[PDB]
Design a protein around this ligand. Structure first.
Ligand code: HEM
Ligand code: HEM
Lengths: 462, 465
């Protein structure tokens, strides 16, 4: 059985590495998606095929073909991401929903994510930057090297859990909060636990598992979180994501109470580790590039002198900080790849793609490709200067994806990271210490991970 | 899921090759079980551990340990073979049955395999020797090379199908016989078709399949064969083959009789157990005679002494062919066509100083132990004299196991040895064998459920006088 699809790419003449029975090419992933994808690009060229168990995946690098997949043919042919598999009510989560159901949910949610509602949301979220400074100061004053994940992760989880669930939380300075302990538990679910990695090898189990109400999600942890958010909703009727969705419940039928909870949960899964990782990578680049850090601090000092609290409108003016964030995301696109399932046979941009193949856009490869970037391993924020905008193809540079199924939280994530970076750089200056892994090494994971934690030394300003 | 047992040999201090998720070490078998077992013996020592999918298998080479597994702790701990998996009524076949069910059917079949009953069966079986000679004469007389499998396969099938189903068949000279075509279709099933090899990667599917009455065997053929045997059973009601002996047994002692359905299952399993084994060994024996002309001559000399002037072989005369027994035994040493024995460990135990956990399969590498210089002098040389009476105490019966050992050993051993001798006598009374341009020397083996040759064995056969 373990070989039935393994002839597909050879029959179509798409190059690729030879798959093993049952495993496909999965063992080759374990050195990291980013290195495996690049190796395939270097040796097979513009297009290649691989197998993740029995699932074939076609890699594409042509920006015209990528626009066709991500944009033009999104609703018709390439509408859904790969299942993973047995879920329950989390079928309603915007990132898991498919076809017409996804379209309704993305539509219901678009009001919640406008820049206008974001601007209204900032004053409640600037508060969490104060906790970050408190947490960082407590770690950095002892003279010790700081583990960036500890404080930036706490900031990421505090901000996204608070606005998604409607509950101010402080994970470090109040770890006994049930919400902290439970949300922490929730976040233990990784798409790389041995349950998911077995479903990929025999995906025919999902129908049986769903017939038995088995889910890959922590059923108990979600049961408590739902039963707790129920009480908040009933008390609140006597500007976070929870309120915005509540307000939208009165073309598409409004969100059900169950559909809303699925959104709140998926926001945390989507926002926690991405934002945490990217914040750490940004500070790492700043530490290893003093004069870039110096120029960020000068600019912050210009718009927000004397540790003035950041606002939407002021953060919106940190154009250089924007370039620094954009250049960090080129080097470390934490999702690595984009994926779409082909719903039917098509020929696009000179290539036939059979039904059921997963199209894969290797963002990391395109971000690091010398064809599109000079010295692509160099951290040069100037690539994202206003004047170099014509030379950046939005199908080559895709840290938040593209098209109708892109990151719906991109604008919130950028502002949120700038709010935190401002606070922290208003008060501190980062520098490599003894334990800092330089150059940084990456490690296998669902997202871009570091081999060893990023440790720097943080010095107070004045 | 794909590694759930893969730490087990590490955790026990037992060495072995690093297994892959889901597959275990299975990709390494495809070069041949015999060559894989020997490689593991060389580089890992007396004991080693492998994984066939999720199933851990422990190889042992110590005769004392082998004798604990095969003999002492057989009914208590090492009772059953590995399943393969979904089977229907064939659960009653002796080789597949387990625990008290196996103990029952093996006891009901013991009367049928006594040497007395064997002797009463030879007058009926010697006939297929004449058919064998006729088929060989037709191929050999043109002076062409003869493909040993073609006549020896036919003989083995004719013999085992005739005595198991109770009809005389002649596969070559009457190939449109419906029994021939169906038995040939039945034997198409091999323990290596991809269905049984996917069940090994996910064994939890077997209960599902059995709930759906799905079977790994060809239900098609077994249906027609059962209906055919039933008509035969009524004609006899108004006579010494395996069918009769199991019918007669149907007439309590320590166990209830065989049901008609249990009887059919044994007839089917007899053909699976005896067809390809008997064919391959007969060809290996003729290959050794052709490549060792003196041994052939000495064998013929003994045959002419006991059965002068082409006298037909009988049970009492074939019993007198002491040197022919040496040849057969030496051939089976070089070519133990089963390669290995296996037993499932029913429960935790510690035998001769080694702990073995529940659910492991213990494996005895017969082929490894037959070619092991630790126990044989020049083990690659074909020397029939290791089995002379003067050298009886030099043959450890847990090192030399072409028929297995203990209560779960090959119940057809004695029939097999006599059946082969009946065949070799007729053939060696009428022909001498010689290598030709196409005889692969030395013989190259190939991967399979039994020991197979790379290329078919092809020899020249000259008639005597
Ligand atoms: C730096 C932080 C983040 C990064 C780098 C990131 C990256 C991505 C990427 C690459 C995708 C796939 C888009 C595609 O396939 O085209 C995605 C999807 C998504 N992200 Fe983000 N994300 C981040 C933060 C967030 C936040 C804060 C939220 C919510 C508040 C969020 C919610 C989502 C959702 C719901 C989807 C699925 C969209 C859909 O299927 O309609 N993400 N993200
Ligand atoms: C050259 C011929 C043959 C060889 C080399 C051979 C070899 C073997 C071996 C190695 C075993 C496994 C024993 C163990 O696991 O300890 C076995 C089992 C068996 N053989 Fe034979 N065999 C031959 C012919 C036959 C014939 C002709 C029959 C039937 C008349 C037969 C019936 C069986 C049965 C029923 C079993 C399973 C018995 C049980 O599990 O209790 N075999 N054979």
């Amino acid at each position: 059985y373990g070989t039935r699809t393994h002839g597909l790419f050879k029959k179509l003449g798409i190059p690729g590495p030879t798959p093993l029975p049952f495993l496909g090419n999965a063992l080759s992933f374990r050195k990291g998606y980013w290195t495996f994808d690049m190796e395939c690009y270097k040796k097979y060229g513009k297009v290649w095929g691989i197998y993740d168990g029995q699932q074939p995946m076609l890699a594409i690098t042509d920006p015209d073909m990528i626009k066709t997949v991500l944009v033009k043919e999104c609703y018709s042919v390439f509408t859904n991401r790969r299942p993973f598999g047995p879920v329950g009510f989390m079928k309603n989560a915007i990132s898991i929903a498919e076809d017409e159901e996804w379209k309704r949910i993305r539509s219901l949610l678009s009001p919640t994510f406008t820049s206008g509602k974001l601007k209204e949301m900032v004053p409640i979220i600037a508060q969490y930057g104060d906790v970050l400074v408190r947490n960082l100061r407590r770690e950095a004053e002892t003279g010790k090297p700081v583990t960036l994940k500890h404080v930036f992760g706490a900031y990421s989880m505090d901000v996204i859990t608070s606005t998604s669930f409607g509950v101010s939380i402080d994970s470090l300075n109040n770890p006994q909060d049930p919400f902290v302990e439970n949300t922490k538990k929730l976040l233990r679910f990784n798409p790389l636990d041995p349950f998911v990695l077995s479903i990929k090898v025999f995906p025919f189990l999902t129908p049986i598992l769903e017939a038995l109400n088995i889910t890959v999600f922590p059923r108990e942890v979600i049961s408590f979180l739902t039963k707790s958010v129920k009480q908040i909703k009933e008390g609140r009727l006597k500007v976070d994501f929870l309120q915005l969705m509540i307000d939208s419940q009165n073309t598409h039928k409004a969100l059900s109470d169950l559909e809303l909870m699925a959104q709140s949960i998926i926001f945390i899964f989507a926002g926690y580790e991405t934002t945490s990782s990217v914040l750490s990578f940004i500070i790492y680049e700043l530490a290893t590039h003093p004069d870039v850090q110096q120029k960020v601090q000068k600019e912050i000092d210009t718009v927000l002198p004397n540790k003035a609290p950041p606002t939407y409108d002021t953060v919106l003016q940190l154009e250089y900080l924007d370039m620094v964030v954009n250049e960090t995301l080129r080097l470390f696109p934490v999702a690595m790849r984009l994926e779409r399932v082909c719903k039917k046979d098509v020929e696009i941009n000179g290539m036939f793609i059979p039904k059921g193949v997963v199209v894969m856009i290797p963002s990391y490869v395109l971000h690091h490709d010398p064809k599109y970037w000079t010295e692509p391993e160099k951290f040069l924020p100037e690539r994202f200067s206003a004047a170099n905008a014509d030379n950046i193809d939005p199908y080559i540079y895709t840290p938040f994806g593209s098209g109708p199924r892109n990151c719906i939280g991109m604008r919130f994530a950028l502002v949120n990271m700038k709010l935190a970076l401002v606070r922290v750089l208003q008060n501190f200056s980062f520098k490599p210490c003894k334990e800092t892994q330089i150059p940084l090494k990456l490690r296998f994971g669902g997202l871009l991970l570091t081999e060893k934690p990023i440790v720097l030394k943080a010095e107070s300003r004045d």
